[PDB]
Amino acid sequence: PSVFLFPPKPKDTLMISRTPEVTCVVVDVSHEDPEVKFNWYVDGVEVHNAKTKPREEQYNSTYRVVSVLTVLHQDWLNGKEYKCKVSNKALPAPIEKTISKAKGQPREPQVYTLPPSREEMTKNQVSLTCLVKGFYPSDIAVEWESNGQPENNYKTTPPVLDSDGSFFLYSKLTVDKSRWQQGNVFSCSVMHEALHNHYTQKSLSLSP
Amino acid sequence: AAGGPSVFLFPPKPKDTLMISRTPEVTCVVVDVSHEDPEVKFNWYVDGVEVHNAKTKPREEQYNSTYRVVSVLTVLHQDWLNGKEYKCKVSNKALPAPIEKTISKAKGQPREPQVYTLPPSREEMTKNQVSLTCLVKGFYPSDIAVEWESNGQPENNYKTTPPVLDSDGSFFLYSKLTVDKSRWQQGNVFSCSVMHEALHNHYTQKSLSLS
Ligand SMILES: *[C@@H]1O[C@H](CO[C@@H]2O[C@@H](C)[C@@H](O)[C@@H](O)[C@@H]2O)[C@@H](O[C@@H]2O[C@H](CO)[C@@H](O[C@@H]3O[C@H](CO[C@H]4O[C@H](CO)[C@@H](O)[C@H](O)[C@@H]4O[C@@H]4O[C@H](CO)[C@@H](O)[C@H](O)[C@H]4NC(C)=O)[C@@H](O)[C@H](O[C@H]4O[C@H](CO)[C@@H](O)[C@H](O)[C@@H]4O[C@@H]4O[C@H](CO)[C@@H](O)[C@H](O)[C@H]4NC(C)=O)[C@@H]3O)[C@H](O)[C@H]2NC(C)=O)[C@H](O)[C@H]1NC(C)=O
Ligand SMILES: *[C@@H]1O[C@H](CO[C@@H]2O[C@@H](C)[C@@H](O)[C@@H](O)[C@@H]2O)[C@@H](O[C@@H]2O[C@H](CO)[C@@H](O[C@@H]3O[C@H](CO[C@H]4O[C@H](CO)[C@@H](O)[C@H](O)[C@@H]4O[C@@H]4O[C@H](CO)[C@@H](O)[C@H](O)[C@H]4NC(C)=O)[C@@H](O)[C@H](O[C@H]4O[C@H](CO)[C@@H](O)[C@H](O)[C@@H]4O[C@@H]4O[C@H](CO)[C@@H](O)[C@H](O)[C@H]4NC(C)=O)[C@@H]3O)[C@H](O)[C@H]2NC(C)=O)[C@H](O)[C@H]1NC(C)=O
Secondary structure, X not given: OEEEEEOOOHHHHHOOOOOOEEEEXXXXXXXXOOOOEEEEEEOOEXXXXXXXXXXXXXXXXXXXXXXXXXXXXXXXXXXXXXXXXXXXXXXXXXXXXXXXXXXXXXXXXXXXXXOOOOOHHHOOEEEEEEEEEEEEOOOOEEEEEEOXXXXXXXXXXXXXXOOOOOEEEEEEEEEEHHHHHOOOOEEEEEEOOOOHHHEEEEEEOOOO | OOOOOEEEEEOOOHXXXXXXXXXXXXXXXXEEEOOOOOOOEEXXXXXXXXXXXXXXXXXXXXXXXXXXXXXXXXXXXXXXXOOXXXXXXXXXXXXXXXXXEEEOOOOOOOEOOEEEEEOOOHHHHHOOEEEEEEEEEEEEOOOOEEEEEEOOEEOOOEEEOOOEEOOOOXXXXXXXXXXXXXXXXXXXXXXXXXXXXOOHHHXXXXXXXXX
């Protein structure tokens, strides 16, 4: 009976309206004995606002069981540690796992939008590029929007270690050449802990 | 022998397979050859046919007090690019049966990358350093080589992202070259070179300069 501990999603830790959650999912719990207790700790203290979802049989007839702990944005961003502690009857030792935010002095990313190259204008789909460089540590969120809705067709590289010890990444958003040619404005939104309000937005549109 | 000698098979480097003036090599490396049983025999096979052009290196002693033997098979660019299988067979009397390893190019229909160069953002023109971007878009499979040069010489203060899987099943990546604002101001020309099996001549080069 083995444990997996998942951290809150970056964007949930960065925007205070959202709810960051730490997840403790126990997998491979027998029919034999299947009951399982969850106790949660922040810097070694007992918390009791965990919402635990009932046992779930897979096809592996083996049961999965999830305890979700809601956390405070500042506690996570300040580096506090979260331990999940699981008590099954199916092994003597109640067994445990910790996580916390990755360490490192925050570095503020620079965000730059780049129009498509003139060679791509022969195609009827074109690429809009968002470059995010100089950030540390690497937990980040990047998204594209237009006129207040999210834009589907994009993909973001994973962070890449630059020469100066900071990270960079690129996000490519693909759109119809027509929408670009009509002067539609597209925004790159970036969320990172070293930004003011943890948020910035840079716009991009067909220039005159 | 540690838990017996063990074998590792290394493919050629992509660039060597793609430029025909370079020499692509498959390398078979055997480690943990005991002092009691120090002889090792390589047999090479390409699509199940033995070849005899391999170049076997002496036999070098490691600090664990145990041997390392390397054999090097030169391969044909087009044989590798056509998907042929390379097979190393290693015999040593510390082993009950000979060990064999197989290697070959990543499979799948090739697709040609498009290469676009993007100048630095106007907002970056405040800083001392600016970023020149090479977008390489739509390629399959993912083995690729991307380099930056200026006046024939490499630049090397650049980083390439790994291939990212795109929505249409192909890959793309970006290559970022960081340059002194002054060299970009002077009109210095920079060039992104790409090597990939679906390019004409396996090669292309896109240039950008100021204005
Ligand atoms: C019975 O069948 C079920 C059915 O589930 C199956 O799920 C997938 C994999 C498909 O096969 C489905 O078709 C199928 O239905 C089995 O359930 C699976 O069990 C395995 C093993 O127990 C788990 O694999 C582990 O995965 C986690 C990370 O998984 C996330 O991403 C998965 C995509 O691959 C996704 O499917 C998962 O749902 C999970 O998603 C997370 O969900 C949480 C909460 O819901 C959420 O917060 C997140 O949004 C989301 N996160 C992500 C990233 O998507 C991982 O823990 C495991 O990796 C460990 O082991 C490797 C060995 O080293 C290593 O590569 C990893 O780094 C990690 O290793 C540990 O890492 C750290 C250091 O970094 C350290 O603590 C440790 O020292 C180190 N080493 C070890 C040994 O721990 C592994 O990849 C599946 O996730 C799980 N599926 C689901 C849906 O839960 C079940 O196991 C079967 N029973 C049997 C065989 O008995
Ligand atoms: C005794 O000593 C010897 C000699 O080692 C040297 O001397 C001692 C005294 C120390 O000082 C050492 O530090 C020193 O290295 C030991 O021999 C070592 O044995 C281990 C295994 O026990 C081998 O590990 C394998 O490593 C390869 C990658 O190795 C490259 O990179 C190393 C640097 O990181 C470098 O040291 C190697 O020389 C080799 O370098 C490459 O060389 C080629 C040509 O020679 C060159 O073209 C390349 O440019 C160059 N590259 C680099 C980066 O330098 C690794 O691939 C293996 O991983 C596979 O196997 C693992 C299990 O064995 C598995 O966990 C992995 O996931 C991985 O699995 C593979 O996955 C791929 C992809 O999916 C798949 O295609 C494969 O089928 C699959 N293969 C397998 C087997 O599953 C592996 O980790 C060391 O290379 C080797 N060292 C040397 C120098 O040869 C020995 O261990 C010592 N024994 C005792 C008892 O002490």
